[PDB]
Amino acid sequence: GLTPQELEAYGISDVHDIVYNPSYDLLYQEELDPSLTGYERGVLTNLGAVAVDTGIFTGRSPKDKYIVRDDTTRDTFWWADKGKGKNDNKPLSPETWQHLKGLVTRQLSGKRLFVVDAFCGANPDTRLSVRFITEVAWQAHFVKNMFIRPSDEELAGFKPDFIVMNGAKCTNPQWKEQGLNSENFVAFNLTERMQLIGGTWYGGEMKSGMFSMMNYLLPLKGIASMHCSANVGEKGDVAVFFGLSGTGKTTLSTDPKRRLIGDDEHGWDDDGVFNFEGGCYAKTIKLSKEAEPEIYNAIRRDALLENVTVREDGTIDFDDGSKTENTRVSYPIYHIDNIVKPVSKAGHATKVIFLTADAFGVLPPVSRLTADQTQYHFLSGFTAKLAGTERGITEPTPTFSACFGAAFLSLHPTQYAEVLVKRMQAAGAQAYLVNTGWNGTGKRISIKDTRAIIDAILNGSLDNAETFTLPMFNLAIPTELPGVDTKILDPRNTYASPEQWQEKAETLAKLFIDNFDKYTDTPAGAALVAAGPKL
Ligand SMILES: Nc1ncnc2c1ncn2[C@@H]1O[C@H](COP(=O)(O)OP(=O)(O)OP(=O)(O)O)[C@@H](O)[C@H]1O
Numbered sequence: 039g040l041t042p043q044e045l046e047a048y049g050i051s052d053v054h055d056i057v058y059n060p061s062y063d064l065l066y067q068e069e070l071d072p073s074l075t076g077y078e079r080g081v082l083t084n085l086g087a088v089a090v091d092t093g094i095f096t097g098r099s100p101k102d103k104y105i106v107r108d109d110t111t112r113d114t115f116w117w118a119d120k121g122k123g124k125n126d127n128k129p130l131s132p133e134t135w136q137h138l139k140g141l142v143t144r145q146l147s148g149k150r151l152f153v154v155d156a157f158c159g160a161n162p163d164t165r166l167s168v169r170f171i172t173e174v175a176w177q178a179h180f181v182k183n184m185f186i187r188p189s190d191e192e193l194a195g196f197k198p199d200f201i202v203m204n205g206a207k208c209t210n211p212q213w214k215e216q217g218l219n220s221e222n223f224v225a226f227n228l229t230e231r232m233q234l235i236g237g238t239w240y241g242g243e244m245k246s247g248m249f250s251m252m253n254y255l256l257p258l259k260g261i262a263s264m265h266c267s268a269n270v271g272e273k274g275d276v277a278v279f280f281g282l283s284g285t286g287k288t289t290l291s292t293d294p295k296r297r298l299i300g301d302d303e304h305g306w307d308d309d310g311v312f313n314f315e316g317g318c319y320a321k322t323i324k325l326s327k328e329a330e331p332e333i334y335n336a337i338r339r340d341a342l343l344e345n346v347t348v349r350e351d352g353t354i355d356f357d358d359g360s361k362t363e364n365t366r367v368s369y370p371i372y373h374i375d376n377i378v379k380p381v382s383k384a385g386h387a388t389k390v391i392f393l394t395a396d397a398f399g400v401l402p403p404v405s406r407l408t409a410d411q412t413q414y415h416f417l418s419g420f421t422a423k424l425a426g427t428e429r430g431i432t433e434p435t436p437t438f439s440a441c442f443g444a445a446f447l448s449l450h451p452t453q454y455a456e457v458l459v460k461r462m463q464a465a466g467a468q469a470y471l472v473n474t475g476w477n478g479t480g481k482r483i484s485i486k487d488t489r490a491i492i493d494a495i496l497n498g499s500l501d502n503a504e505t506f507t508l509p510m511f512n513l514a515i516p517t518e519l520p521g522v523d524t525k526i527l528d529p530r531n532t533y534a535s536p537e538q539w540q541e542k543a544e545t546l547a548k549l550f551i552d553n554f555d556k557y558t559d560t561p562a563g564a565a566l567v568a569a570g571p572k573l
């Protein structure tokens with residue numbers, strides 16, 4: 039356990055009630071306490087899982103993310119203001135940090151506090167020992183699910199390496215005078231080894247905050263740090279699935295034929311690929327028990343639903359995105375039946391899958407990448423969406439996010455690329471581009487077809503298939519694949535003619551070219567242009 043004087047050390051005073059390492063049973067009764075008000079309230083669903091609303095913030099707030107610039111961070115961080123590409127790593131002063139710390143520590147003072155000790159990183163040599171402090175039971179539940187739950191033995195010798203103080207209920211009235219974005223804040227200090235959260239209740243800030251910290255510390259020690267899911271076959275063949283939010287990393291890694299290593303966040307060291315987390319954070323929008331039975335089955339007692347609409351009878355409307363499109367459920371990883379255990383890690387990845395949801399309907403469902411294309415597409419980090427749907431228009435809107443996760447990058451995209459390539463080359467890994475998004479049907483490729491594509495990548499079918507070169511993007515695509523619909527494999531087949539596809543392909547290529555130009559300020563970047571799409 040821990041004493042109230044141990045919290046004083048952090049600046050939190052007069053804490054009468056400390057709930058250290060709350061059990062799942064305790065979190066359940068806390069959440070369902072009928073006297074809770076506002077966003078603290080949990081409701082019990084017919085699936086046995088507790089549902090909560092995360093408040094005004096139903097996703098991350100990258101515009102409120104700040105990192106203290108000091109002698110420890112100055113020369114290594116990928117700062118928002120240093121002319122090295124757009125990012126959310128906005129510099130914060132030590133003085134302004136101290137003000138934010140006072141807000142949170144005063145807010146947590148005199149309150150009933152939940153303290154969750156956990157690990158970020160499956161390996162003792164590189165894991166953070168994180169102490170999370172919160173005044174909201176469901177927030178403690180979120181981190182219990184999403185971080186590695188220490189054994190009783192590990193708890194006895196637990197020494198925090200990082201402190202996360204969640205003061206969601208407090209705001210910053212000085213934000214205007216302090217040059218900040220809003221009264222809310224998601225702040226990091228690498229000198230004091232601390233994250234502070236104010237204003238936003240969204241639990242994801244804690245998950246993505248610690249990921250940002252691993253993304254900083256690990257590649258500085260030669261370890262790749264990756265926004266990917268990962269799984270392993272019976273033979274010990276490991277695959278990682280990169281991709282932006284909504285591209286299928288959680289959906290497609292949850293494959294009953296494969297043992298799940300992890301959902302979202304992985305390191306790659308001398309020994310192999312290892313999960314940072316102790317749980318999975320699935321999307322539930324339009325969730326289908328038939329399409330995703332394993333994810334659906336995971337939704338039960340100890341899972342935590344977010345922003346879903348719950349009917350009066352306790353049933354959930356998974357289709358209802360009224361509160362948000364970003365409806366989620368966290369659950370501890372063992373809610374998945376086939377997982378790597380007791381420790382979430384395996385060997386070196388030999389299959390590297392880049393997932394993308396191409397709203398432009400240009401990209402093939404699968405193509406095997408060249409070495410240079412792998413690098414080009416990794417730095418590009420493309421996905422798109424239909425932004426106009428609620429208005430009855432397409433509005434395909436592109437996102438280029440370096441390393442398929444620029445939002446969590448603490449170092450230059452190039453540093454992530456370099457270490458990924460080093461690990462890939464030593465392992466003889468191969469890379470694949472998968473479009474889990476749209477084609478000329480104006481509809482998304484089915485989950486079934488995509489799963490059958492993944493099967494073909496993993497089992498070697500794709501590697502041994504006859505291929506030809508898709509024009510413009512110069513992508514090796516197969517003529518056919520076992521278990522896959524042949525028509526869809528060539529992105530041109532779902533339009534009236536190849537020329538209608540070409541119109542869209544030219545548009546998309548120009549976006550890639552315009553976007554990549556920022557990487558050409560170096561000889562290696564400039565050399566990668568040849569691997570990109572060509573008009
Ligand atoms: N062909 C397809 N392949 C994969 N997912 C699909 C497909 N068609 C529809 N989907 C839906 O797209 C979403 C993919 O979301 P998923 O949870 O895998 O995102 P993610 O890549 O894990 O993102 P995050 O980093 O935010 O966790 C799900 O809602 C899934 O039901």
Ligand SMILES: [Mg+2]
Nearest residue numbers: 287288302319
């Ligand atoms: Mg996911």
Ligand SMILES: [Mn+2]
Nearest residue numbers: 052053054148
């Ligand atoms: Mn007192």
Ligand SMILES: [Mn+2]
Nearest residue numbers: 265282283302
């Ligand atoms: Mn993610």
